[PDB]
Curated annotation (Swiss-Prot), chain A:
Disruption phenotype: Embryonic lethal. Knockout embryos die at 5 to 6 dpc, before gastrulation. Predominantly expressed in neurons in the cortex and in the dentate gyrus, CA1 and CA3 regions of the hippocampus (at protein level). Expressed at lower levels in astrocytes, oligodendrocytes and microglia (at protein level). In the cerebellum, present in Purkinje and granule cells (at protein level). It is found in: Cytoplasmic vesicle, Clathrin-coated vesicle membrane; Cytoplasmic vesicle, Secretory vesicle, Synaptic vesicle membrane; Melanosome. Subunit of the V0 complex of vacuolar(H+)-ATPase (V-ATPase), a multisubunit enzyme composed of a peripheral complex (V1) that hydrolyzes ATP and a membrane integral complex (V0) that translocates protons. V-ATPase is responsible for the acidification of various organelles, such as lysosomes, endosomes, the trans-Golgi network, and secretory granules, including synaptic vesicles. In certain cell types, can be exported to the plasma membrane, where it is involved in the acidification of the extracellular environment. Required for assembly and activity of the vacuolar ATPase. This is V-type proton ATPase 116 kDa subunit a 1. Belongs to the V-ATPase 116 kDa subunit family. It comes from Mus musculus (Mouse). The chain holds residues 51 to 135 of 839 of the full protein.
Swiss-Prot record, chain B:
It is found in: Apical cell membrane; Cytoplasmic vesicle, Secretory vesicle, Synaptic vesicle membrane; Cytoplasmic vesicle, Clathrin-coated vesicle membrane. Belongs to the V-ATPase E subunit family. The lineage of its organism: Eukaryota, Metazoa, Chordata, Craniata, Vertebrata. This is V-type proton ATPase subunit E 1. Expressed within the midpiece of sperm tail (at protein level). Kidney; localizes to early distal nephron, encompassing thick ascending limbs and distal convoluted tubules (at protein level). The chain holds residues 2 to 57 of 226 of the full protein. The modification N-acetylalanine is found at A1.
From Swiss-Prot, chain C:
GO terms for molecular function: proton-transporting ATPase activity, rotational mechanism. Pfam families: V-ATPase_H_C (PF11698), V-ATPase_H_N (PF03224). It comes from Mus musculus. The keyword Ion transport applies. It is found in: Cytoplasmic vesicle, Clathrin-coated vesicle membrane. Keywords: Cytoplasmic vesicle, Hydrogen ion transport, Ion transport, Membrane, Phosphoprotein, Transport. Subunit of the V1 complex of vacuolar(H+)-ATPase (V-ATPase), a multisubunit enzyme composed of a peripheral complex (V1) that hydrolyzes ATP and a membrane integral complex (V0) that translocates protons. V-ATPase is responsible for acidifying and maintaining the pH of intracellular compartments and in some cell types, is targeted to the plasma membrane, where it is responsible for acidifying the extracellular environment. Subunit H is essential for V-ATPase activity, but not for the assembly of the complex. It is a peripheral membrane protein. It comes from the Eukaryota. The gene is Atp6v1h. Belongs to the V-ATPase H subunit family. One of its GO terms (biological process) is synaptic vesicle lumen acidification. GO terms for cellular component: ATPase complex; clathrin-coated vesicle membrane; presynapse; proton-transporting V-type ATPase complex; proton-transporting V-type ATPase, V1 domain; vacuolar proton-transporting V-type ATPase, V1 domain. The modification Phosphoserine is found at S43. This is V-type proton ATPase subunit H.
Length: 85, 56, 426, 49
């Protein structure tokens, strides 16, 4: 049964990734309540895989906007070089 | 009884489990045996139909 | 459990057949066979049933079953006969009790019968109807059984229904009559009962009958028109009961190994498009089982599904549909190998494919085809910075900028991804 | 649980005796937990003590 635990650890790693991301973003946590809400399907594994895909494209958006700002860092330089004669 | 009745219930459910499981297994073996049957019969028809066609 | 409970209930009841061996009330002669062969475990008895020559065996017992007919009287006589007809491990086997002089013993006696489908009467009738597959006697008329209510009224109402369907699945073995039943609308009824919610045992029986019907290549090809493969993958996703997964896997295996015509096997691509069964297999492989069938079939299906997706990954039909403008979400679009090696094929004469996709993006308003085309263009421009200059010269960047602000935020997000792949070095 | 996921599971339970020492336990509340903690700070003793 160790495979289930390994998949859970992967799930934990992805959840930590998003956690540290939202802590860098500094978005206040809601925590409405609902402690007794535990369900018992087997299908939520697919749903959490989908949310890990959401986290993957989030990692893409970060690794992409960092490139965008780097591009701007030379765009502004080109503008300044243009301002002169 | 309660404890002995539970033991009897457990025995009955275990018998039901073996019954269903290996009954389905037995029919699965027989269905494989039908596929088996038809494949070998087809090969046989090919082999004999050959000689039939030349002779005729 | 109702039928087994009834059988156990009336097994112990010993009828007074000796009070009228050949005596009062119940007839007066047909207890000469009953007195013989009372020891069912006796080799001598099971081999000397042939001494009867059928004269009493299932000749007078036939129409004695109608002689007695009371909810108490004929319920006891009914079981005391049909429990012997049911055990039948090697006693009759290949129709030893023959009764050649009259055909009614073989088949036509149940027309008045098939009544009161609850006090075991339809159950005995179905059991004697269940004397074809492992018994040597060819049914005189398939429609004399396929079109009678013995199953029709039991479809909806449950252990009696389960036992009826058990007799049915025991009988559906040899194609000579399964074809006769498939020509009827029985396929539609099987599909409807499948869609109907019920106990998991009944659902297993239904998929089991489907697996039995899967034997026939040409009739599977004829019944391609129904959406059985996705309804079955859907119930597979909805239920995990081990034996059910095994039988569904065996049915898919049967389809793949029969495969009458590759041209008619358009369902090869459906098996992933309609629902990625490979995603379910990705988990089911991790669970190991002692049954060699499960492991061998899952390995064989993984390999064959790999071949299927690899063959599906192509450029010819891809460019055909991209030209026609019908852009469904095929998994070939995301196939990395297409853009690693086959990327230059999109560069047709004068970049015909890219320009016509720009035109179709300008024309069509459908969010999903717009998304598909935009993603394809983005993944193409991801690797060819020269074609990036070509696209910039064409001016499609302005089209993507216009489609960025759009009612479908999904199209907006994909447009942002495409414009970003253009922002690579730009 | 069985009616949550119904598959004819009686969930049978049997009682048996042995020599293994059962573990100690004492229900507490919001105004005895501190004292239970202080007393268990020096270990917990034998069964039915």
């Amino acid at each position: 049964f160790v495979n289930e635990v390994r998949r859970c650890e992967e799930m934990d790693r992805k959840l930590r990734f998003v956690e540290k991301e939202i802590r860098k973003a500094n978005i206040p946590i809601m925590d409405t309540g609902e402690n007794p809400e535990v369900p018992f399907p087997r299908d939520m594994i697919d749903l959490e895989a989908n949310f890990e895909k959401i986290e993957n494209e989030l990692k893409e958006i970060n690794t992409n906007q960092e490139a965008l700002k780097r591009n701007f860092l030379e765009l502004t330089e080109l503008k300044f070089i243009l301002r002169k004669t | 009884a309660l404890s002995d009745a539970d033991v009897q219930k457990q025995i009955k459910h275990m018998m039901a489990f073996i019954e269903q499981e290996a009954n389905e297994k037995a029919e699965e073996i027989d269905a494989k045996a039908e596929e088996e049957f038809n494949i070998e019969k087809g090969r046989l028809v090919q082999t004999q139909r050959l000689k039939i066609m030349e002779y005729y | 459990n109702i039928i087994a409970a009834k059988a156990a209930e009336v097994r112990a009841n010993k009828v007074n057949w000796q009070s009228y061996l050949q005596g009062q009330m119940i007839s007066a002669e047909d207890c000469e066979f009953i007195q013989r062969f009372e020891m069912k475990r006796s080799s001598e008895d099971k081999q000397e049933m042939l001494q009867t020559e059928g004269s009493q065996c299932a000749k007078t017992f036939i129409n004695l079953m109608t002689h007695i007919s009371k909810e108490q009287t004929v319920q006891y006589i009914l079981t005391m006969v049909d429990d012997m007809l049911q055990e039948n491990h090697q006693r009759v086997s290949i129709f030893f009790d023959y009764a050649k002089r009259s055909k009614s013993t073989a088949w036509p006696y149940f027309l008045p019968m098939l009544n009161r489908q609850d006090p075991f009467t339809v159950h005995m009738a179905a059991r004697i109807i269940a004397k074809l597959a492992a018994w040597g006697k060819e049914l005189m008329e398939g429609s004399d059984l396929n079109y009678y209510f013995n199953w029709i009224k039991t479809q909806l109402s449950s252990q009696y229904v389960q036992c009826v369907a058990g007799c049915l699945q025991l009988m559906l073995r040899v194609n000579e009559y399964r074809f006769a039943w498939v020509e009827a609308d029985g396929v539609n009824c099987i599909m409807g009962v499948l869609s109907n919610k019920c106990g998991f045992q009944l659902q297993y029986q239904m998929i089991f009958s489907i697996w039995l019907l899967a034997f026939s290549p040409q009739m599977c090809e004829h019944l391609r028109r129904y959406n059985i493969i996705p309804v079955l993958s859907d119930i597979l996703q909805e239920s995990v009961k081990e034996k059910v997964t095994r039988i569904i896997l065996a049915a898919f295996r049967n389809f793949l190994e029969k495969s009458t015509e590759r041209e008619t096997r358009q369902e090869y691509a459906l098996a992933m498009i309609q629902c990625k069964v490979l995603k379910q297999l990705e988990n089911l492989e991790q669970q190991k089982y002692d049954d060699e069938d499960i492991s061998e079939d899952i390995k064989f299906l993984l390999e064959k599904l790999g071949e299927s997706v690899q063959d599906l990954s192509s450029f010819d039909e891809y460019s055909s549909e991209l030209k026609s403008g019908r852009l469904e979400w095929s998994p070939v679009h995301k196939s990395e190998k297409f853009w690693r090696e086959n990327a230059v094929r999109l560069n047709e004469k004068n970049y015909e494919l890219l320009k016509i996709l720009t035109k179709l993006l300008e024309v069509s308003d459908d969010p999903q085809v717009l998304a598909v085309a935009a993603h394809d263009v983005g993944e193409y421009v991801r690797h060819y910075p020269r074609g990036k200059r070509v696209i910039e010269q064409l001016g499609g960047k302005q089209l993507v900028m216009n489609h960025m602000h759009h009612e479908d935020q999904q199209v907006r997000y994909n447009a942002l991804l495409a414009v970003q792949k253009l922002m690579v070095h730009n | 649980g069985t009616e949550h996921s119904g598959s004819t599971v009686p969930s049978i339970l049997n009682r048996m005796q042995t020599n293994q020492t059962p573990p100690t336990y004492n229900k507490t509340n919001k105004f005895t937990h501190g004292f239970q903690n202080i007393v268990d700070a020096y270990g917990i003793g034998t069964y039915r003590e």
